[PDB]
Design a protein around this ligand. Structure first.
Ligand SMILES: [Cl-]
Ligand SMILES: [Cl-]
Ligand SMILES: [Mg+2]
Ligand SMILES: [Mg+2]
Ligand SMILES: [Mg+2]
Ligand SMILES: [Mg+2]
Ligand SMILES: [Mg+2]
Ligand SMILES: [Mg+2]
Ligand SMILES: [Mg+2]
Ligand SMILES: [Mg+2]
Ligand SMILES: [Mg+2]
Ligand SMILES: [Mg+2]
Ligand SMILES: [Mg+2]
Ligand SMILES: [Mg+2]
Ligand code: NA
Ligand code: NA
Ligand code: NA
Ligand code: NA
Ligand code: NA
Ligand code: NA
Ligand code: NA
Ligand code: NA
Ligand code: NA
Ligand code: NA
Ligand code: NA
Ligand code: NA
Ligand code: NA
Ligand SMILES: [Sr+2]
Ligand SMILES: [Sr+2]
Ligand SMILES: [Sr+2]
Ligand SMILES: [Sr+2]
Ligand SMILES: [Sr+2]
Ligand SMILES: [Sr+2]
Ligand SMILES: [Sr+2]
Ligand SMILES: [Sr+2]
Ligand SMILES: [Sr+2]
Ligand SMILES: [Sr+2]
Ligand SMILES: [Sr+2]
Ligand SMILES: [Sr+2]
Ligand SMILES: [Sr+2]
Ligand SMILES: [Sr+2]
Ligand SMILES: [Sr+2]
Ligand SMILES: [Sr+2]
Ligand SMILES: [Sr+2]
Ligand SMILES: [Sr+2]
Ligand SMILES: [Sr+2]
Ligand SMILES: [Sr+2]
Ligand SMILES: [Sr+2]
Ligand SMILES: [Sr+2]
Ligand SMILES: [Sr+2]
Ligand SMILES: [Sr+2]
Ligand SMILES: [Sr+2]
Ligand SMILES: [Sr+2]
Ligand SMILES: [Sr+2]
Ligand SMILES: [Sr+2]
Ligand SMILES: [Sr+2]
Lengths: 46, 82, 143, 56, 81
RNA sequence: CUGUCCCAACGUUGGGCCCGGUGAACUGUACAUUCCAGUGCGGAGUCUGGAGACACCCAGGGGGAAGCGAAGACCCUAUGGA
RNA sequence: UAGGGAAACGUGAUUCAACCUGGGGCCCAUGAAAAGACGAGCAUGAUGUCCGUACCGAGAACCGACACAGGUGUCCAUGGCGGCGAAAGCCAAGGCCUGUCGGGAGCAACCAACGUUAGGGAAUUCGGCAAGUUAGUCCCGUACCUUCGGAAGAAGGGAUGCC
RNA sequence: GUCGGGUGAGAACCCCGACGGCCUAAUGGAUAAGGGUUCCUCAGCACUGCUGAUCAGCUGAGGGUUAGCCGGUCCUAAGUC
RNA sequence: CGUGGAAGUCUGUUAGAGUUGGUGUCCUACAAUACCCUCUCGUGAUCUAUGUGUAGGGGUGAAAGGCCCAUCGAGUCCGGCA
RNA sequence: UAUGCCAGCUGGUGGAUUGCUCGGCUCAGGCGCUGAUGAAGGACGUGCCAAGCUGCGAUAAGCUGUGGGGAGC
């Protein structure tokens, strides 16, 4: 499939959102990413 | 050290297409019994492997002449074909 | 040690298939430190990384058979599998036969052996399928 | 051919996509109409009284 | 108002283009053209740009591979910043 | 023409069986070692009378639990539907 | 006196996909359009922006809740032997040992796939269900019937290797 | 698949060699759709993987897609707005 | 006798399409329609990809009440509705 | 006495119960339009390190003025 410039930006954001909750937030809140999406197991938009 | 003739007729009990695999197990079992060692300690040189697999996985020779040596502290056996 | 990444690189460097690239069993540790394509080329030159020769099917047995068949043997009724017109196309055989008969008659016209009246009589008969071969045509011309 | 599992294999067509107006994956890229907000059909936003219970 | 050059793209592949091909890599604004990326690099670093190659990265940003002239040295321009 | 049959045999491969590892589901009112008769809403492991019965486990082919699965699609009934 | 190759760094031929160009036949069927190009020369110089570009493309990257024995379009249809063949079977190039749990018991009963069974030969069964028989090629030869096309590979008989 | 060997706390199944095999319109090569980072590197084994795993499409962090002349873009088709 | 090469023509696991029998295997499946062998069509009323049109008492239908996203003698969703 | 039955004890498993309430539910009073000067809503951005939420908008968890406030942020 051929992606447009906007579709590319959206897919890019989804990949960035797929990162873990940094080590320092666990220490600041004194002790989980609920938007963990997999390429196979989950489904994106469009 | 001595030269022994290993009978591989008990490989017929195992299915035809897998005869070479069982032959290699029979060789290890024989050398472990006759040389008074553990099966884990018997090292078969690739010459034996190639001898038993020569005509494929199904057509294994009924016998095989093998030269084996016995040495070391724990006790082990290095074996090869002739 | 995991040399699978190097196997892919060696295959591109040597321009050979992955299954044909050989790695020295004694030099596994040196090939493990091979990160780049330049490290691989260095090891190719050292003889540590080599490429096996590709097989080519022997045509010797085929050549012997081609000789017997060219001589007319090994083509008996027990060797034929296809139908008659499959072994030799009848339309192609007529093209071979009639072009040969039309060339023979054109040569005999340019030689002066046959007149434009005799030629026409023989050409039309050839186009009607009166002559089996060129030899059968020559046998009709000579009375 | 079964209407179930073997007919699901031909499903590689893109219809419903992310909408320019509302952000929902309901913009039908062949009809050019959004099934959620009505973009491409109306200037007014698609809303219906049946999307809630009668006395609510 | 948006700026053309966001920041320099400094990775290993960016250094190989700097040491060997005299190319500087930049992360630029996605609305910026090749010609606009060329002008901004000349006006900010006092160099002469020959060719600009762009790519819309999977990070939402635009990466630009900017080749300088032989009078300018890419290693010297990257060292001062 | 032949293992469809008379009439079955031997063999081959994968299972099956034992061992390591992984590891569900169906089903479960309770009790429950049953068998023969009887009785009972007339088709009982459980009531009555007898008989038999030391406990636990392995493999088996499925006689019984009117076995498990599905608020019978037949039939009738409903001031039911289509 | 580009490139590439360790080296040699060939020459002729046959059959010829691609591609080029013609002849014929068929239609109660008649086989796109537009942009563009040609028509309409040459030099030098400048400009040529924007978007896509990773990877999978499947018995694990797609759809089917799954790393699903299903489903899913295109081009490689000219690799060798074989033979009518883009068939079988075997083998290159290339790919793979991931149609991804293993070890053990002449390894019993029973089951799934299957081989061979003397004599009999459909007695089996609703029923030859299942299985089997026949088979490629050439020569000879071929009935009733028929809309004269066909029936027809009717049937039946013979041949078949290698040197 | 087997015999050796490599790495590792740990190896039937991660890697090397040899031997033995499997695939030939495909189990090879290039792609459309569709997927969306699954690609490469390093570090890992709590999760996922029909057993195990040092391996991985898994976990974490980094990196990676460069065009005047390949597509889009332009044209018009059934047809749509 | 040859030439010619017609055909909803024939053989054909060419590609591709289809699905007769086994009432085989499976039947908490590999699979909410699968597997194997067998079998049918394969230059045409042929097969196929993509784009496009027809919408619910309405389509579409070489007609089986077939099909209209595992849903059809009137799709699906929500509402009427407790 | 093995397999095992009943009740309990110690320890699990499980999360009932009791206590707690940053949320709800309902009633009442007050108030009440926004948008081409581009709203509402959405997309994508924006932090030293930032995935979610909130805020914000390339001047991006913020800029200016006045008043309040106060030694913290
Ligand atoms: Cl011609
Ligand atoms: Cl493209
Ligand atoms: Mg990442
Ligand atoms: Mg002819
Ligand atoms: Mg570009
Ligand atoms: Mg009922
Ligand atoms: Mg009735
Ligand atoms: Mg009625
Ligand atoms: Mg798999
Ligand atoms: Mg018999
Ligand atoms: Mg009878
Ligand atoms: Mg039959
Ligand atoms: Mg690694
Ligand atoms: Mg269509
Ligand atoms: Na997905
Ligand atoms: Na950045
Ligand atoms: Na039999
Ligand atoms: Na029973
Ligand atoms: Na050939
Ligand atoms: Na494995
Ligand atoms: Na004629
Ligand atoms: Na079938
Ligand atoms: Na038919
Ligand atoms: Na309706
Ligand atoms: Na017990
Ligand atoms: Na108000
Ligand atoms: Na954040
Ligand atoms: Sr999926
Ligand atoms: Sr059909
Ligand atoms: Sr489709
Ligand atoms: Sr409209
Ligand atoms: Sr409304
Ligand atoms: Sr990145
Ligand atoms: Sr049983
Ligand atoms: Sr019912
Ligand atoms: Sr020619
Ligand atoms: Sr590519
Ligand atoms: Sr497939
Ligand atoms: Sr099927
Ligand atoms: Sr090969
Ligand atoms: Sr596995
Ligand atoms: Sr025999
Ligand atoms: Sr009979
Ligand atoms: Sr009978
Ligand atoms: Sr005959
Ligand atoms: Sr491919
Ligand atoms: Sr571990
Ligand atoms: Sr990988
Ligand atoms: Sr257009
Ligand atoms: Sr035909
Ligand atoms: Sr039937
Ligand atoms: Sr099965
Ligand atoms: Sr079934
Ligand atoms: Sr059968
Ligand atoms: Sr046919
Ligand atoms: Sr309701």
């Amino acid at each position: 499939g051929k992606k447009s410039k906007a579709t590319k930006k959206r897919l890019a954001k989804l990949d960035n959102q797929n990162s873990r909750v940094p080590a320092w937030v666990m220490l600041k809140t004194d002790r989980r990413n609920h938007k963990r999406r997999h390429w196979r197991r989950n489904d994106t938009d469009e | 050290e001595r030269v022994v003739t290993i009978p591989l007729r008990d490989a017929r009990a195992e299915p035809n297409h897998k005869r070479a695999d069982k032959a290699m197990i029979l060789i290890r079992e024989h050398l472990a019994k006759h040389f008074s060692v553990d099966e884990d300690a018997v090292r078969l040189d690739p010459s034996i492997n190639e001898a038993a697999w020569a005509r494929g996985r199904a057509n294994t020779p009924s016998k095989i002449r093998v030269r084996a040596a016995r040495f070391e502290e724990e006790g082990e056996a290095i074996v090869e074909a002739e | 040690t995991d040399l699978s990444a190097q196997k892919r690189l060696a295959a591109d460097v040597l321009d050979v298939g992955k299954n044909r690239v050989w790695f020295n069993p004694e030099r596994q540790g040196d090939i493990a430190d091979a990160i780049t394509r330049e490290d691989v080329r260095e090891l190719v030159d050292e003889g540590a990384i080599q490429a096996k020769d590709k097989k080519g099917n022997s045509r010797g047995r085929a050549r012997e058979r081609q000789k017997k068949r060219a001589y007319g043997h090994q083509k008996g009724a027990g060797s034929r599998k296809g139908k008659a017109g499959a072994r030799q196309n009848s339309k192609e055989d007529w093209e071979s036969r009639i072009r040969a008969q039309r060339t023979k008659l054109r040569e005999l016209r340019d030689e002066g052996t046959l007149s434009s009246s005799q030629y026409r009589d023989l050409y039309d008969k050839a186009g009607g399928g009166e002559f089996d071969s060129v030899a059968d045509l020559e046998r009709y011309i000579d009375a | 051919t079964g209407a179930g599992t073997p007919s699901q294999g031909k499903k590689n067509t893109t219809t419903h996509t992310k909408c320019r107006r509302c952000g929902e994956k309901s913009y039908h890229t062949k009809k050019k109409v959004c099934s959620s907000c009505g973009f491409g059909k109306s200037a007014k936003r698609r809303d219906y009284e049946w999307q809630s219970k009668a006395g609510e | 108002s948006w700026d053309v050059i966001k920041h320099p793209h400094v990775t290993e592949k960016a250094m190989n283009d700097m040491d060997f091909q005299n190319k500087l890599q930049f992360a630029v604004d996605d609305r910026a053209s090749k010609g606009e990326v060329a002008d901004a690099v000349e006006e900010q670093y006092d160099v002469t740009v020959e060719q600009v190659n762009t790519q819309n990265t999977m990070d939402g940003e635009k990466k630009a591979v900017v080749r300088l002239s032989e009078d300018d040295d890419a290693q010297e321009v990257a060292s001062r910043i």
